[PDB]
Amino acid sequence: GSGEPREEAGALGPAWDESQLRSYSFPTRPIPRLSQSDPRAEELIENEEPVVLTDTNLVYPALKWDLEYLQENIGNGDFSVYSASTHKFLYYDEKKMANFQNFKPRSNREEMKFHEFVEKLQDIQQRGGEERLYLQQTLNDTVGRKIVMDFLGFNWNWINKQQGKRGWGQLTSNLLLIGMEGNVTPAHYDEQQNFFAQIKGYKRCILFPPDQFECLYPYPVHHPCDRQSQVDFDNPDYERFPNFQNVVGYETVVGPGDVLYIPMYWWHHIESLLNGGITITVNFWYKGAPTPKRIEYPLKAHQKVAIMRNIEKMLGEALGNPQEVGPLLNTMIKGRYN
Amino acid sequence: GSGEPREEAGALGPAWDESQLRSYSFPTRPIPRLSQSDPRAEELIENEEPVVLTDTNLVYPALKWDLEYLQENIGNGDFSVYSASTHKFLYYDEKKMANFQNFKPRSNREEMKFHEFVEKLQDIQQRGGEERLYLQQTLNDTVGRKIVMDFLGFNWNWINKQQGKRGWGQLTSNLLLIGMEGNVTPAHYDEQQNFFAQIKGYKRCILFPPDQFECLYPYPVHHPCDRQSQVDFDNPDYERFPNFQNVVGYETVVGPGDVLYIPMYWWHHIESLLNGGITITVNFWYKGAPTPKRIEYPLKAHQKVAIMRNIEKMLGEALGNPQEVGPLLNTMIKGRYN
Amino acid sequence: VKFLVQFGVNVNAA
Amino acid sequence: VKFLVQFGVNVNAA
Ligand SMILES: O=C(O)CNC(=O)C(=O)O
Ligand SMILES: O=C(O)CNC(=O)C(=O)O
Ligand SMILES: [Zn+2]
Ligand SMILES: [Zn+2]
């Protein structure tokens, strides 16, 4: 579903091949790859559907980024680095950990300087260790002057126009992601609009529309893994998650200079290609446009997801305990709505 | 569970016997019968638990009421009379009928003068017809002068004190109920506090506490039979309603001069005794006391019922269609909270 | 919370 | 309705 691997310029061969993609149980179809000047691209972003833009130059100055350059210039701030035994780096919200004492995270977060991160990578590589690391840090004003120049050299003209055109809210942050080959961020949805700017290496992105909520089984909203799918894509439990047999994804492989629009509330699964080396991405997260004063029916799928989130949140507050939300919901439906 | 039939004064024999009670699948225990001067009675009404008060004199002037007296004096207003093929007079909300076109009521409502109601009773009796009628009309200012005198002669001193003592809201109405022997009002709960004043004949009252919500399976809040149990007490469907096998009722038989406190949100099933003649009741419905400014946890069962009602109401309004509430609730729980 | 626990006045009558 | 359809800004980051 990703599509035929693109041929690199100057007869450099296929950028990647299918053997670097993980194997899953569901079909996919390709996300369109278009020029930012293509009116179809503007039609997909306006309809809140995904598209890969090949020529935005959004992060053109960062395409020279590698570990050496970043370590030399990214400053001496702290970087959040996640470590795991497994390739799956499931996100967890540490604030919500108090609610569920039973949950024990597969991955661990450690704060370190950028040179320490590079050192751990080298150490793991040198000893042939199985540990995996994923660096995930929002860009902030502690970065070095060269990085500031690169950041200023992003294509703000194009993306500010997009923000204005769509009525989106403010840019909330830019997340720097540096991963090891084979790293996976499991399926989840975010609440903000995202322009996903690939810099180094290749990432396979599998997206699912908001109307596949009933096939992805997100954790309860109060659980630390709120917004993530409960389904283990590598070993799906069809008895607990029967409608995962009905999921269909939208797939693409993004490379240096590609920008993927991940619309808000769209599920996405992101994996750095096997044996593809390290990957570098910077995303651009924007608050969604304000809800219109006059709500129009029929509601969009993501509006219904928002309703469900808000019901779960209200019940948790009203009952005084997040653990009680499940029992009350079952009491409400059993023999009444099922 | 009703208790031994009481012996009538002056050696008149048992007022009723067990053979006049319908047979059901669940156990019961008796509602306490106490004097209004008994501090235990005041303790049960303050804790919102049911009690039968034997000596309130609440409707003492109405104990002389029969069909002849009422027809002569109740005026020429219209009375709501319900007619049914079966003994079960399931209440339905006519405003909510638009939401469910499929629902067809077992009983029919007709407006008529009191003498027409007495005539239908006589006609049915004379021809030995199987039709059943239940008169259910709130008292209003069209009543005759003698009825006004009787109404004024109720024990307002005692019940106004109760209203003040419990912090209840206003008296909202007095419902006059005249039924045929064997008539049944199926299990349901009301949202208002109720003093249930028996006048003529005997009624078996089976009550269930609000915490048995999960065993009584009320209809959806937007369904015309909102607040009524879906379970057919005469032929319970344990596959759809498995926890009806766990219901336990509180039972009593009220007679002329008895007043039953039916606390708000308490389920009640009310049947006029087989072969006991017509029954006459007047109830006293009061708005519950205002919710306290500081909510205290743990929540009461009826507060959790109120939460569920309000969730169902909000979703119906938000989705724009009452039919969609069931599907969204299932989507929210399946594989997530069950 | 206070909004959610609010109760109506509906009974089996008009 | 407008209250219910409101959306947050939560993402996989602090
Ligand atoms: O790139 C990854 O591994 C994960 N990124 C995201 O989920 C995102 O940018 O929204
Ligand atoms: O008496 C009946 O048949 C029904 N009455 C009630 O449900 C009531 O008074 O709340
Ligand atoms: Zn994401
Ligand atoms: Zn009632």
XYZ file of C-alpha atoms and ligand atoms in Angstrom:
726
model
C 0.000 0.000 0.000
C 3.009 2.266 0.446
C 3.649 2.242 -3.283
C 6.616 1.434 -5.476
C 9.828 2.656 -3.871
C 10.896 5.925 -5.461
C 14.074 5.966 -7.529
C 16.689 8.426 -5.911
C 18.093 11.212 -8.334
C 21.381 10.603 -10.256
C 20.711 6.822 -10.646
C 21.331 6.173 -6.826
C 18.890 3.094 -6.886
C 15.724 2.572 -4.863
C 15.743 4.607 -1.690
C 14.284 1.590 0.131
C 12.628 -1.751 -0.546
C 9.657 -3.653 0.827
C 11.866 -5.961 2.906
C 12.449 -2.998 5.241
C 8.713 -2.774 6.052
C 7.080 -4.640 8.920
C 4.299 -7.116 8.133
C 0.760 -6.472 9.400
C -2.679 -8.041 9.121
C -4.606 -5.264 7.368
C -4.690 -3.857 3.826
C -3.708 -0.312 2.922
C -3.893 2.070 0.003
C -1.396 4.829 -0.758
C -1.484 8.384 0.510
C -1.246 10.677 -2.498
C 2.252 12.257 -3.124
C 1.708 15.708 -4.684
C 3.320 19.047 -5.317
C 2.372 21.861 -2.963
C 1.344 23.725 -6.136
C -1.124 20.979 -7.061
C -4.710 22.162 -6.373
C -5.571 18.589 -5.379
C -3.129 18.951 -2.480
C -4.869 22.097 -1.285
C -8.285 20.249 -1.752
C -7.044 17.278 0.520
C -5.626 19.616 3.335
C -8.927 21.746 3.246
C -11.039 18.402 3.561
C -8.732 17.290 6.403
C -7.397 14.293 4.507
C -3.737 13.244 4.463
C -1.324 14.107 1.676
C 2.438 13.952 1.174
C 3.860 17.210 -0.179
C 7.142 16.637 -1.980
C 8.412 20.181 -2.621
C 7.469 22.499 0.241
C 11.088 23.212 1.236
C 9.506 23.455 4.689
C 12.674 22.370 6.514
C 15.154 22.745 3.664
C 17.968 24.083 5.936
C 17.627 21.051 8.242
C 18.256 18.506 5.466
C 21.975 18.831 6.236
C 21.303 17.766 9.837
C 23.064 14.692 11.171
C 24.206 13.664 14.643
C 27.594 15.366 14.287
C 26.116 18.700 13.190
C 23.366 18.625 15.827
C 25.724 17.754 18.689
C 28.013 20.599 17.627
C 25.206 23.164 17.381
C 22.017 22.136 19.213
C 23.197 23.575 22.524
C 23.574 22.164 26.011
C 19.922 21.803 26.972
C 18.264 18.637 28.229
C 16.667 16.217 25.758
C 13.971 13.664 26.553
C 15.196 10.255 25.456
C 13.050 7.156 25.658
C 14.522 3.719 26.064
C 12.929 0.368 25.436
C 13.522 -3.355 25.298
C 11.167 -3.620 22.335
C 10.836 -1.789 19.045
C 7.422 -0.451 20.127
C 7.653 2.966 21.841
C 4.133 3.331 23.234
C 3.578 6.843 24.586
C 2.339 7.214 28.169
C 1.160 10.310 30.036
C 3.048 10.482 33.318
C 0.421 12.725 34.949
C -2.199 10.004 34.516
C -0.018 7.326 36.081
C -1.490 7.966 39.540
C -4.928 6.877 38.294
C -3.701 3.445 37.258
C -1.117 2.009 39.651
C -1.142 -1.291 37.773
C 0.215 0.121 34.513
C 3.941 -0.330 34.108
C 5.491 1.277 31.055
C 7.544 -0.699 28.568
C 9.738 2.308 27.825
C 11.567 4.657 30.172
C 12.254 8.374 29.896
C 15.634 9.885 30.769
C 16.817 13.482 30.459
C 20.266 13.950 29.005
C 22.505 16.213 26.989
C 22.610 15.653 23.246
C 26.179 14.338 23.395
C 25.116 11.749 25.985
C 22.409 10.551 23.593
C 24.944 10.184 20.778
C 27.208 8.333 23.221
C 24.524 5.804 24.176
C 23.825 5.163 20.486
C 27.499 4.533 19.870
C 27.784 2.346 22.928
C 24.783 0.266 22.004
C 26.031 -0.085 18.462
C 29.559 -0.962 19.510
C 28.483 -3.730 21.851
C 25.692 -4.936 19.582
C 23.130 -4.419 22.350
C 19.411 -4.802 21.778
C 18.365 -1.640 23.619
C 16.532 0.996 21.601
C 16.409 4.747 22.045
C 14.059 7.401 20.728
C 14.779 11.085 21.242
C 11.663 13.236 21.378
C 12.250 16.862 22.389
C 10.410 20.060 21.535
C 12.646 22.755 20.092
C 13.231 25.619 22.522
C 15.362 28.735 22.852
C 18.352 26.850 24.316
C 19.422 25.759 20.849
C 22.665 26.956 19.313
C 22.942 29.871 16.928
C 23.375 27.698 13.858
C 20.165 25.831 14.707
C 18.405 29.146 15.208
C 19.520 30.169 11.716
C 18.300 26.837 10.308
C 14.977 27.149 12.141
C 14.531 30.702 10.834
C 15.238 29.342 7.356
C 12.193 27.082 7.404
C 9.467 27.951 4.890
C 7.312 30.005 7.225
C 5.834 31.809 4.223
C 4.203 28.588 3.000
C 3.132 27.152 6.346
C 1.866 30.465 7.744
C -0.331 30.711 4.668
C -1.607 27.213 5.369
C -2.359 28.143 8.943
C -4.218 31.229 7.813
C -6.025 29.423 5.036
C -7.342 26.712 7.326
C -8.234 29.008 10.217
C -6.008 26.974 12.519
C -4.860 28.218 15.894
C -1.297 28.891 16.915
C 1.747 26.771 16.305
C 2.068 25.089 19.697
C 5.425 23.357 19.273
C 7.960 21.663 17.018
C 8.917 18.170 18.161
C 12.370 16.915 17.189
C 12.316 13.130 16.735
C 15.510 11.100 16.317
C 15.032 7.346 16.219
C 16.932 4.147 15.599
C 16.175 1.975 12.586
C 13.185 -0.241 13.297
C 11.730 2.033 15.992
C 7.914 2.085 15.997
C 5.506 4.624 17.433
C 2.295 2.581 17.829
C -1.058 3.683 16.443
C -2.531 6.764 18.118
C -4.249 10.023 17.302
C -3.281 13.552 18.281
C -5.673 16.434 18.879
C -3.683 19.007 16.906
C -3.120 19.510 13.181
C 0.261 18.229 12.106
C 2.719 18.960 9.313
C 5.252 16.138 9.634
C 8.584 17.160 8.064
C 10.993 14.310 7.311
C 14.702 15.185 7.429
C 16.900 12.058 7.531
C 16.125 8.438 6.746
C 12.755 6.984 5.850
C 9.598 6.468 7.895
C 6.600 4.348 6.974
C 3.412 6.128 8.052
C 0.132 4.212 8.278
C -2.890 6.401 8.893
C -6.463 5.542 9.765
C -9.400 7.936 9.566
C -11.280 9.023 12.655
C -14.276 6.914 11.584
C -12.214 3.794 12.339
C -12.407 4.557 16.083
C -14.410 1.376 16.590
C -11.658 -0.766 15.041
C -8.623 0.721 16.990
C -9.934 0.525 20.571
C -8.175 3.451 22.291
C -7.389 3.179 25.967
C -9.766 4.880 28.414
C -9.286 8.660 28.429
C -8.015 8.666 32.184
C -5.442 5.735 31.343
C -1.825 6.946 30.764
C -2.063 5.651 27.167
C -5.080 7.808 26.333
C -5.306 8.308 22.536
C -3.210 5.180 21.786
C -4.681 1.989 20.344
C -4.873 -1.009 22.673
C -4.317 -3.373 19.726
C -0.877 -4.976 19.422
C -0.387 -4.634 15.661
C 2.182 -7.463 15.797
C -0.176 -9.911 17.586
C -3.750 -8.617 17.372
C -6.212 -10.106 19.849
C -9.330 -10.561 17.710
C -11.362 -11.818 20.671
C -10.953 -8.537 22.561
C -10.699 -6.371 19.427
C -12.846 -8.067 16.776
C -13.314 -5.011 14.552
C -9.567 -4.719 14.090
C -10.277 -7.277 11.366
C -12.032 -4.466 9.510
C -9.291 -1.792 9.619
C -7.965 -0.311 6.419
C -4.972 2.082 6.474
C -3.595 4.829 4.311
C 0.137 4.262 3.816
C 3.239 6.093 2.628
C 7.000 6.162 3.143
C 8.344 9.677 3.686
C 11.934 10.618 2.983
C 14.155 13.694 3.328
C 12.356 16.781 2.109
C 8.762 15.147 2.280
C 6.063 16.682 4.424
C 3.078 14.580 5.499
C -0.123 16.302 6.552
C -1.521 14.288 9.463
C -4.965 15.786 10.069
C -6.168 16.125 13.636
C -7.821 13.033 15.148
C -6.403 10.847 12.392
C -4.759 7.706 13.722
C -1.164 7.179 12.699
C 1.415 4.418 13.098
C 5.003 5.481 12.357
C 8.004 3.172 11.932
C 11.604 3.906 10.984
C 12.539 1.487 8.226
C 14.395 -1.664 9.210
C 18.125 -1.346 8.472
C 17.551 2.200 7.202
C 19.804 3.964 9.695
C 18.698 6.683 12.070
C 15.716 8.859 11.218
C 15.206 12.553 11.918
C 11.854 14.330 11.794
C 10.539 17.697 12.913
C 6.786 18.122 13.212
C 4.664 21.280 13.306
C 1.678 21.073 15.669
C -1.183 23.577 15.343
C -4.347 23.945 17.378
C -7.357 23.151 15.234
C -9.677 25.825 13.932
C -12.342 26.905 16.417
C -15.611 25.044 16.314
C -18.106 26.977 14.213
C -20.844 28.842 16.056
C -23.523 26.941 14.192
C -22.814 23.227 14.396
C -23.802 21.424 11.238
C -25.330 17.992 11.072
C -24.303 15.453 10.123
C -21.435 15.572 12.616
C -17.957 14.629 11.473
C -16.397 11.465 12.860
C -13.834 13.441 14.854
C -16.597 15.509 16.461
C -18.164 12.280 17.686
C -14.758 11.242 19.053
C -14.629 14.576 20.883
C -18.073 13.913 22.359
C -16.940 10.522 23.667
C -13.770 11.992 25.167
C -15.809 14.686 26.883
C -18.342 12.187 28.260
C -15.516 10.113 29.734
C -13.930 13.238 31.230
C -17.241 14.476 32.756
C -18.023 11.100 34.303
C -14.563 10.838 35.841
C -15.016 14.227 37.482
C -18.633 13.624 38.526
C -18.051 10.168 40.003
C -14.952 11.432 41.817
C -12.889 8.456 40.632
C -11.682 7.536 37.144
C -11.912 3.773 38.042
C -15.776 4.064 38.404
C -16.338 5.400 34.752
C -16.300 1.852 33.245
C -18.843 0.313 35.639
C -21.296 3.191 35.234
C -21.092 3.083 31.435
C -21.790 -0.674 31.436
C -24.710 -0.208 33.832
C -26.098 2.399 31.434
C -25.970 0.179 28.329
C -26.430 -3.415 29.374
C -29.867 -4.592 28.481
C -30.781 -1.020 27.495
C -28.727 -0.050 24.432
C -27.043 -3.337 23.440
C -43.069 -10.768 51.902
C -46.199 -8.656 52.264
C -46.800 -10.042 55.732
C -49.698 -11.737 57.464
C -52.986 -10.196 56.368
C -54.211 -7.771 59.008
C -57.367 -8.640 60.924
C -60.125 -5.909 60.264
C -61.652 -4.250 63.506
C -64.884 -5.679 65.053
C -64.009 -9.308 64.076
C -64.631 -8.585 60.269
C -62.028 -11.347 59.252
C -58.859 -10.944 57.207
C -59.018 -7.915 54.968
C -57.418 -10.002 52.206
C -55.580 -13.271 51.663
C -52.524 -14.397 49.732
C -54.627 -15.926 46.945
C -55.391 -12.361 45.813
C -51.680 -11.664 45.173
C -49.978 -12.294 41.845
C -47.061 -14.735 41.724
C -43.575 -13.493 40.805
C -40.054 -14.872 40.540
C -38.260 -12.804 43.187
C -38.217 -12.751 46.999
C -39.379 -9.818 49.097
C -39.293 -8.627 52.675
C -41.926 -6.459 54.345
C -42.041 -2.687 54.430
C -42.371 -1.633 58.055
C -45.942 -0.570 59.168
C -45.569 2.122 61.862
C -47.351 4.924 63.628
C -46.578 8.440 62.442
C -45.619 9.102 66.081
C -42.999 6.342 65.990
C -39.489 7.883 65.804
C -38.447 4.951 63.610
C -40.934 6.191 61.007
C -39.376 9.645 61.030
C -35.862 7.937 60.841
C -36.965 5.910 57.647
C -38.534 9.019 55.836
C -35.351 11.150 56.712
C -33.066 8.257 55.245
C -35.338 8.109 52.172
C -36.492 4.567 52.861
C -40.090 3.377 52.492
C -42.518 3.059 55.380
C -46.261 2.533 55.756
C -47.842 5.014 58.168
C -51.071 3.662 59.614
C -52.522 6.671 61.463
C -51.732 9.904 59.625
C -55.395 10.731 58.915
C -53.862 12.272 55.791
C -56.985 11.743 53.668
C -59.453 10.943 56.440
C -62.357 12.851 54.767
C -61.877 10.864 51.534
C -62.342 7.466 53.215
C -66.080 7.845 52.574
C -65.387 8.172 48.837
C -66.995 5.686 46.477
C -68.114 5.903 42.855
C -71.585 7.183 43.761
C -70.276 9.980 45.990
C -67.553 10.998 43.527
C -69.889 11.080 40.519
C -72.316 13.233 42.503
C -69.648 15.688 43.676
C -66.427 15.553 41.629
C -67.715 18.012 39.037
C -68.050 17.920 35.273
C -64.394 18.120 34.282
C -62.581 15.705 31.996
C -60.833 12.652 33.457
C -58.012 10.698 31.830
C -59.042 7.062 31.627
C -56.735 4.358 30.355
C -58.025 1.219 28.735
C -56.249 -2.045 28.142
C -56.641 -5.600 26.938
C -54.246 -6.777 29.636
C -53.981 -6.225 33.365
C -50.654 -4.408 32.865
C -51.085 -0.623 32.480
C -47.603 0.403 31.343
C -47.250 4.191 31.338
C -46.069 5.880 28.135
C -45.076 9.497 27.507
C -47.002 10.727 24.484
C -44.515 13.541 23.786
C -41.749 10.989 23.245
C -43.799 8.932 20.807
C -42.398 10.841 17.818
C -38.894 9.566 18.628
C -39.925 5.929 18.360
C -42.452 5.305 15.587
C -42.232 1.558 16.165
C -43.631 1.641 19.700
C -47.323 0.876 19.881
C -48.926 1.204 23.291
C -50.846 -1.636 24.890
C -53.191 0.786 26.634
C -55.165 3.717 25.261
C -56.048 7.048 26.838
C -59.512 8.588 26.527
C -60.883 11.769 28.088
C -64.337 11.502 29.579
C -66.674 12.774 32.248
C -66.712 10.912 35.544
C -70.207 9.548 34.900
C -69.032 8.114 31.568
C -66.242 6.287 33.402
C -68.726 4.806 35.876
C -70.911 3.830 32.912
C -68.105 1.955 31.144
C -67.337 0.078 34.370
C -70.966 -0.926 34.684
C -71.164 -1.889 31.044
C -68.046 -3.999 31.196
C -69.239 -5.656 34.367
C -72.725 -6.289 33.040
C -71.526 -7.979 29.877
C -68.652 -9.763 31.594
C -66.149 -8.157 29.218
C -62.409 -8.519 29.653
C -61.552 -4.858 29.071
C -59.842 -3.020 31.914
C -59.925 0.643 32.837
C -57.707 2.775 35.038
C -58.628 6.355 35.864
C -55.633 8.577 36.535
C -56.423 12.288 36.878
C -54.749 15.065 38.834
C -57.112 16.944 41.121
C -57.873 20.451 39.867
C -60.171 23.362 40.648
C -63.070 21.965 38.579
C -64.046 19.654 41.418
C -67.333 20.050 43.247
C -67.742 21.902 46.513
C -68.027 18.759 48.601
C -64.731 17.492 47.175
C -63.155 20.856 47.905
C -64.289 20.506 51.522
C -62.879 16.961 51.661
C -59.595 18.083 50.093
C -59.327 20.955 52.585
C -59.927 18.409 55.343
C -56.766 16.480 54.521
C -54.066 16.540 57.207
C -52.046 19.404 55.780
C -50.638 20.095 59.242
C -48.824 16.742 59.252
C -47.711 16.653 55.625
C -46.638 20.310 55.512
C -44.427 19.559 58.495
C -42.973 16.615 56.605
C -42.307 18.797 53.606
C -40.605 21.372 55.780
C -38.677 18.794 57.748
C -37.239 17.152 54.655
C -36.500 20.373 52.782
C -38.636 19.177 49.884
C -39.882 21.480 47.163
C -43.486 22.281 46.415
C -46.406 19.923 46.198
C -46.670 19.547 42.427
C -49.926 17.600 42.172
C -52.344 15.080 43.649
C -53.124 12.179 41.326
C -56.495 10.477 41.754
C -56.234 6.788 40.828
C -59.311 4.574 40.463
C -58.632 1.064 39.221
C -60.352 -2.243 38.640
C -59.449 -5.303 40.689
C -56.353 -6.957 39.264
C -55.048 -3.796 37.571
C -51.241 -3.541 37.622
C -48.986 -0.533 37.210
C -45.674 -2.125 36.143
C -42.372 -1.412 37.865
C -41.082 2.137 37.413
C -39.533 4.978 39.355
C -40.698 8.567 39.688
C -38.470 11.596 40.181
C -40.574 13.186 42.922
C -41.127 12.297 46.576
C -44.424 10.538 47.090
C -46.890 10.092 49.936
C -49.272 7.439 48.605
C -52.638 7.654 50.403
C -54.883 4.598 50.066
C -58.634 5.258 50.231
C -60.663 2.261 49.000
C -59.688 -1.354 48.449
C -56.236 -2.850 48.801
C -53.077 -2.433 46.738
C -49.960 -4.578 46.872
C -46.884 -2.364 46.531
C -43.508 -3.894 45.669
C -40.614 -1.472 45.904
C -37.008 -1.771 44.819
C -34.201 0.548 45.888
C -32.413 2.764 43.408
C -29.298 0.575 43.686
C -31.197 -2.176 41.848
C -31.082 -0.119 38.625
C -28.918 -2.797 37.036
C -31.536 -5.496 37.692
C -34.665 -3.576 36.371
C -33.381 -2.412 32.969
C -35.311 0.837 32.388
C -36.117 1.852 28.849
C -33.859 4.438 27.194
C -34.541 7.943 28.522
C -35.847 9.220 25.004
C -38.251 6.049 24.719
C -41.921 6.779 25.656
C -41.579 4.301 28.557
C -38.674 6.177 30.135
C -38.438 5.301 33.863
C -40.356 2.004 33.428
C -38.702 -1.408 33.651
C -38.373 -3.363 30.408
C -38.773 -6.649 32.313
C -42.118 -8.436 31.992
C -42.589 -9.485 35.623
C -45.004 -12.213 34.461
C -42.536 -13.732 31.941
C -39.035 -12.410 32.637
C -36.522 -12.784 29.817
C -33.363 -13.804 31.683
C -31.295 -13.812 28.488
C -31.898 -10.100 27.889
C -32.237 -9.210 31.587
C -29.976 -11.623 33.479
C -29.650 -9.541 36.652
C -33.403 -9.633 37.151
C -32.530 -12.953 38.790
C -30.910 -10.898 41.544
C -33.791 -8.512 42.368
C -35.163 -8.343 45.873
C -38.280 -6.252 46.645
C -39.780 -4.534 49.632
C -43.471 -5.439 49.855
C -46.655 -4.321 51.588
C -50.419 -4.274 51.094
C -51.955 -0.873 51.827
C -55.583 -0.438 52.784
C -57.968 2.435 53.537
C -56.325 4.976 55.793
C -52.650 3.704 55.087
C -50.059 6.045 53.657
C -46.976 4.628 51.933
C -43.882 6.781 51.596
C -42.407 6.015 48.171
C -39.054 7.812 48.174
C -37.907 9.465 44.974
C -36.106 7.208 42.475
C -37.378 4.111 44.256
C -38.865 1.568 41.877
C -42.416 0.519 42.609
C -44.848 -2.052 41.226
C -48.479 -1.517 42.263
C -51.349 -3.982 41.807
C -54.973 -3.829 42.919
C -55.750 -7.118 44.623
C -57.445 -9.806 42.563
C -61.179 -9.972 43.328
C -60.782 -7.087 45.785
C -63.151 -4.672 44.063
C -62.216 -1.231 42.825
C -59.346 0.655 44.426
C -59.042 4.377 45.094
C -55.789 6.170 45.876
C -54.666 9.780 46.045
C -50.944 10.484 45.955
C -48.996 13.576 47.013
C -46.026 14.386 44.761
C -43.300 16.757 45.987
C -40.181 17.996 44.248
C -37.111 16.652 45.998
C -34.925 18.806 48.190
C -32.347 20.842 46.281
C -28.981 19.244 45.746
C -26.572 20.431 48.422
C -23.957 22.974 47.393
C -21.161 20.680 48.482
C -21.673 17.251 46.960
C -20.559 14.496 49.277
C -18.849 11.317 48.224
C -19.728 8.555 48.195
C -22.623 9.402 45.880
C -26.034 7.929 46.577
C -27.436 5.388 44.138
C -30.121 7.806 42.954
C -27.489 10.455 42.218
C -25.763 7.964 39.937
C -29.122 7.301 38.257
C -29.447 11.057 37.734
C -25.987 11.149 36.153
C -26.950 8.392 33.711
C -30.209 10.129 32.803
C -28.335 13.362 32.180
C -25.685 11.658 30.028
C -28.411 10.098 27.883
C -30.176 13.461 27.584
C -26.951 15.337 26.633
C -26.005 12.781 23.992
C -29.461 12.900 22.427
C -29.206 16.671 22.107
C -25.573 16.674 20.952
C -25.983 13.946 18.335
C -29.163 15.606 17.060
C -31.052 12.298 17.086
C -32.174 10.132 20.004
C -31.752 6.954 17.825
C -27.913 7.561 17.630
C -27.386 7.535 21.523
C -27.220 3.686 21.666
C -24.622 3.240 18.905
C -22.322 5.912 20.334
C -22.484 4.445 23.842
C -21.586 0.978 22.508
C -18.719 2.425 20.465
C -17.448 4.075 23.649
C -17.427 0.891 25.757
C -16.786 -2.065 23.503
C -13.282 -3.297 23.952
C -12.550 -0.268 26.155
C -14.623 -0.565 29.343
C -16.118 -4.076 29.081
C -20.769 17.388 38.862
C -23.585 19.534 40.243
C -24.825 19.758 36.691
C -24.781 15.966 36.272
C -26.493 14.987 39.520
C -29.439 17.298 38.890
C -32.859 15.650 38.913
C -36.116 16.321 37.106
C -39.745 16.187 38.217
C -41.059 13.513 35.785
C -43.753 11.174 37.022
C -46.321 8.870 35.420
C -48.674 11.764 34.622
C -48.952 14.899 32.507
C -23.644 20.419 22.002
C -20.961 23.064 21.504
C -19.700 22.072 24.915
C -19.536 18.384 23.954
C -17.807 18.721 20.587
C -14.982 20.809 22.029
C -11.480 19.463 21.454
C -8.245 19.619 23.413
C -4.626 20.084 22.364
C -3.146 16.793 23.695
C -0.343 15.196 21.732
C 2.359 12.613 22.432
C 4.562 15.154 24.233
C 4.693 17.339 27.329
O 7.466 10.038 14.416
C 7.064 9.326 15.337
O 7.637 8.281 15.650
C 5.817 9.795 16.079
N 5.304 11.118 15.699
C 4.007 11.500 15.883
O 3.166 10.755 16.372
C 3.557 12.839 15.482
O 4.388 13.572 14.946
O 2.409 13.231 15.653
O -51.203 3.336 41.940
C -50.772 3.022 40.830
O -51.292 2.128 40.159
C -49.560 3.791 40.316
N -49.115 4.917 41.148
C -47.842 5.408 41.125
O -46.967 4.932 40.410
C -47.460 6.538 41.981
O -48.324 6.986 42.735
O -46.337 7.026 41.972
Zn 1.402 11.504 16.701
Zn -45.249 5.843 40.388
